[PDB]
Amino acid sequence: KNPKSDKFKVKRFHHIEFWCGDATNVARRFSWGLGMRFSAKSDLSTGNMVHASYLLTSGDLRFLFTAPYSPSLSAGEIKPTTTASIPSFDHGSCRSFFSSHGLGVRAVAIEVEDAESAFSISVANGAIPSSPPIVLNEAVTIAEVKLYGDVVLRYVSYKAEFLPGFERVEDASSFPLDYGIRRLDHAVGNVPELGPALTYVAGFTGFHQFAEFESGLNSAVLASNDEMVLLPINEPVHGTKRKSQIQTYLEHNEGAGLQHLALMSEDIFRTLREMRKRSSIGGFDFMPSPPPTYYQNLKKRVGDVLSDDQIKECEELGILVDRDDQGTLLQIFTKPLGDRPTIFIEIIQRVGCMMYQSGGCGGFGKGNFSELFKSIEEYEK
Amino acid sequence: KNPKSDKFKVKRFHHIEFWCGDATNVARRFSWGLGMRFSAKSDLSTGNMVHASYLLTSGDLRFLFTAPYSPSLSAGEIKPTTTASIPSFDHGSCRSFFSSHGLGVRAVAIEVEDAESAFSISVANGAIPSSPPIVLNEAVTIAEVKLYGDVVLRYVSYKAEFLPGFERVEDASSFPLDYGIRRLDHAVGNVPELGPALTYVAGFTGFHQFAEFESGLNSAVLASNDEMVLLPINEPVHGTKRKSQIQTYLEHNEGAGLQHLALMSEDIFRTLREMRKRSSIGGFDFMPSPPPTYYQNLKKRVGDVLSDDQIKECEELGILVDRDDQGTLLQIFTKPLGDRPTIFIEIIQRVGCMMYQSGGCGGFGKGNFSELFKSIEEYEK
Numbered sequence: 001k002n003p004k005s006d007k008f009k010v011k012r013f014h015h016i017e018f019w020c021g022d023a024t025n026v027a028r029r030f031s032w033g034l035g036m037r038f039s040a041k042s043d044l045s046t047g048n049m050v051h052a053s054y055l056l057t058s059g060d061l062r063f064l065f066t067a068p069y070s071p072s073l074s075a076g077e078i079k080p081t082t083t084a085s086i087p088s089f090d091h092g093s094c095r096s097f098f099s100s101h102g103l104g105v106r107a108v109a110i111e112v113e114d115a116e117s118a119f120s121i122s123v124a125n126g127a128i129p130s131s132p133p134i135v136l137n138e139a140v141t142i143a144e145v146k147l148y149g150d151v152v153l154r155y156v157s158y159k160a161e162f163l164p165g166f167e168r169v170e171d172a173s174s175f176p177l178d179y180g181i182r183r184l185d186h187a188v189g190n191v192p193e194l195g196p197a198l199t200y201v202a203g204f205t206g207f208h209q210f211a212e213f214e215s216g217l218n219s220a221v222l223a224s225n226d227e228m229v230l231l232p233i234n235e236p237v238h239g240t241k242r243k244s245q246i247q248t249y250l251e252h253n254e255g256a257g258l259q260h261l262a263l264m265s266e267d268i269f270r271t272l273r274e275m276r277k278r279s280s281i282g283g284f285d286f287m288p289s290p291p292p293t294y295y296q297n298l299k300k301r302v303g304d305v306l307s308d309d310q311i312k313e314c315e316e317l318g319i320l321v322d323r324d325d326q327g328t329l330l331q332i333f334t335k336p337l338g339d340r341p342t343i344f345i346e347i348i349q350r351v352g353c354m355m356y357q358s359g360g361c362g363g364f365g366k367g368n369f370s371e372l373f374k375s376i377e378e379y380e381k
Numbered sequence: 382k383n384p385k386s387d388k389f390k391v392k393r394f395h396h397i398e399f400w401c402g403d404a405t406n407v408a409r410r411f412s413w414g415l416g417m418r419f420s421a422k423s424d425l426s427t428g429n430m431v432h433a434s435y436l437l438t439s440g441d442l443r444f445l446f447t448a449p450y451s452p453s454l455s456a457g458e459i460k461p462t463t464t465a466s467i468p469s470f471d472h473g474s475c476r477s478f479f480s481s482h483g484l485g486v487r488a489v490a491i492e493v494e495d496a497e498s499a500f501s502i503s504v505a506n507g508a509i510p511s512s513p514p515i516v517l518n519e520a521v522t523i524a525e526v527k528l529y530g531d532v533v534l535r536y537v538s539y540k541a542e543f544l545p546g547f548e549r550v551e552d553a554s555s556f557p558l559d560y561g562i563r564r565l566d567h568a569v570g571n572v573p574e575l576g577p578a579l580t581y582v583a584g585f586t587g588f589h590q591f592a593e594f595e596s597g598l599n600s601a602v603l604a605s606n607d608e609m610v611l612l613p614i615n616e617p618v619h620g621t622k623r624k625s626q627i628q629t630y631l632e633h634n635e636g637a638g639l640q641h642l643a644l645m646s647e648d649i650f651r652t653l654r655e656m657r658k659r660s661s662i663g664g665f666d667f668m669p670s671p672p673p674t675y676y677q678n679l680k681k682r683v684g685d686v687l688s689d690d691q692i693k694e695c696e697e698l699g700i701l702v703d704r705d706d707q708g709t710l711l712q713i714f715t716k717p718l719g720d721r722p723t724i725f726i727e728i729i730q731r732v733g734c735m736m737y738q739s740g741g742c743g744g745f746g747k748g749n750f751s752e753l754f755k756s757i758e759e760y761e762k
């Protein structure tokens with residue numbers, strides 16, 4: 001059941017913005033590790049005396065990396081005369097964010113029909129304003145409200161190429177890396193209390209709870225009308241044998257924040273081969289693979305969807321497989337992206353629900369907790 | 382003339398420490414870009430609740446990357462009970478350094494016979510103390526004095542494997558990258574006034590001015606007794622046609638600091654081939670190459686040291702060649718390592734002065750300014 005209750009017209013995920021200490025080094029690392037190309041920049045060379053911002057793209061996935069310059073470069077400016085290309089940027093906010101959280105996501109940006117309308121409707125319905133609507137070069141409108149912790153939900157709307165003031169990068173500096181990643185599937189937040197977080201966000205968006213199917217966590221997923229913008233939120237479960245990883249996140253992050261980004265691949269086997277080739281030469285590491293008994297148990301569960309060879313390929317790459325009643329989910333998780341055990345990345349590919357593929361086909365992996373434990377009985381074997 | 386006036390026994394350069402916002406991403410980027418292997422770590426997994434530190438090595442070159450965790454992880458600790466492996470580390474100093482300067486070198490570390498003696502003699506001779514001598518696990522002694530700006534000269538002495546509390550990394554995570562770099566040749570600082578900087582540093586070390594052979598800068602080089610520890614210092618020259626790049630550095634860095642590291646290669650052609658292969662896939666970029674007329678003019682200057690083919694190879698890789706009366710210097714400069722136009726890297730290889738190779742063989746490139754301008758007359762050609 002999807003009541004289609006969006007209080008304003010939402011299109012798709014637009015970009016994810018990381019707040020960094022040094023945008024250059026994070027962007028270069030992510031580009032090599034994930035196979036994303038450098039596609040746009042806004043920095044000193046484009047006249048921006050406030051922040052350095054670099055955009056990586058893979059298909060429709062857009063990762064923006066931003067870091068502040070010395071405030072002294074822009075000390076004469078006021079907001080009416082700013083050289084910042086992202087008018088919501090603030091030196092103090094950015095330094096405070098990074099000192100508090102380390103490297104992480106500041107903005108989850110979605111494209112909407114009218115960012116000014118989305119902002120007004122959101123705040124009228126309880127959203128905490130973060131940055132009011134601003135029209136850039138009479139062409140793009142940008143506005144921000146608080147999502148959870150210090151993460152903002154960013155609205156972007158276009159009258160009719162990233163943002164005004166960004167330049168496409170010299171293709172001599174733009175190497176056409178591509179490991180198969182194509183779009184952001186969903187973005188997951190961690191909060192101390194799930195109930196109030198859901199009420200707040202569902203309150204100002206009109207997003208509905210996405211229909212799904214005892215260790216660590218509870219969660220729920222908020223979804224837009226066509227269920228293409230998907231926002232799961234986790235809370236810790238206290239008192240368990242193993243300490244809740246959600247609680248570990250909250251401790252090391254200094255509170256609520258974005259936990260992970262799920263990136264859709266058009267070919268998850270190619271993506272994982274290419275990413276694993278680079279893990280120890282500047283790329284990303286992956287979580288330890290499930291035991292072989294997990295893959296022995298895969299035939300009974302998805303032997304009608306994957307061949308023996310395709311299953312053996314899952315075992316080689318450490319891929320996890322889950323399934324609801326509409327589709328199948330292939331997934332894998334990286335180790336944390338930076339120093340703290342906070343943010344990480346998931347790679348996914350979904351099988352089924354065609355007609356295009358409907359959002360959330362196969363779910364979010366609710367069945368992989370019990371399948372993993374009832375598989376770690378390989379201790380005996 | 383070298384008076385051999387070192388006020389304490391200095392051995393060689395030991396390591397360079399970068400202060401970062403996220404040590405993981407900077408270290409991974411540098412590892413791939415420069416061909417350095419991950420060799421040691423001190424972080425949460427080793428019991429350090431204060432800072433994350435990762436060591437890269439190539440030959441005898443040691444690059445350490447350090448970033449602070451949330452202070453809350455260590456809020457119960459006091460200095461007597463610290464879990465930091467580097468006792469001079471301070472959360473506030475590190476965050477203040479990075480907010481002020483961005484990514485850069487905090488410590489230039491040299492090995493000495495007795496770090497406690499070196500510290501005492503230095504401070505007795507005018508050195509501003511930064512961190513007093515501390516004995517780690519009854520095995521290593523570490524002390525720090527101010528060098529210039531917020532950069533410290535770090536003394537390390539060993540009774541008899543980096544530092545106690547560091548662990549050698551799992552060789553599954555340690556890929557044996559190597560593009561030919563073997564040691565730190567020299568480390569260059571930028572200051573507003575050269576005179577007082579030289580007097581201060583030569584004052585407390587006893588380092589002497591190294592014997593060498595109108596645009597932008599003046600400099601001088603301080604050297605240890607065997608001239609293996611080499612510390613050039615630059616000051617801006619004001620009022621010139623083109624604005625002094627030293628002054629640009631000082632503006633974007635918020636004052637004095639380390640400008641560049643010169644890394645010796647055992648095979649500069651291999652190093653540059655390998656680094657240039659990776660420039661647009663996560664590595665480092667290089668300064669624009671000199672015009673072909675520069676290389677046309679190379680035969681007359683170093684045709685007795687390099688073959689036509691070796692000269693053509695210099696032209697392919699953009700290598701600069703200088704020469705004093707004792708040896709020849711091959712060199713090249715990277716673009717800035719991070720967001721700000723501040724720190725960069727030089728790759729060098731020296732030819733001559735054998736007997737081992739004496740320090741500074743070929744100089745530091747004093748002759749490449751005039752050779753470059755008188756070559757940019759290729760405009761006519």
Ligand SMILES: O=C(O)C(=O)Cc1ccccc1
Binds near residue numbers: 221245364
């Ligand atoms: O909310 C969800 O749908 C998740 O899957 C979140 C999650 C997944 C794995 C570890 C911790 C949280």
Ligand SMILES: O=C(O)C(=O)Cc1ccccc1
Binds near residue numbers: 615626
């Ligand atoms: O001090 C020196 O020996 C230098 O070469 C410093 C330097 C080199 C190139 C550009 C700016 C400063």
Ligand SMILES: [Co+2]
Binds near residue numbers: 188262346364365
């Ligand atoms: Co997920």
Ligand SMILES: [Co+2]
Binds near residue numbers: 569643727745746
């Ligand atoms: Co130099």
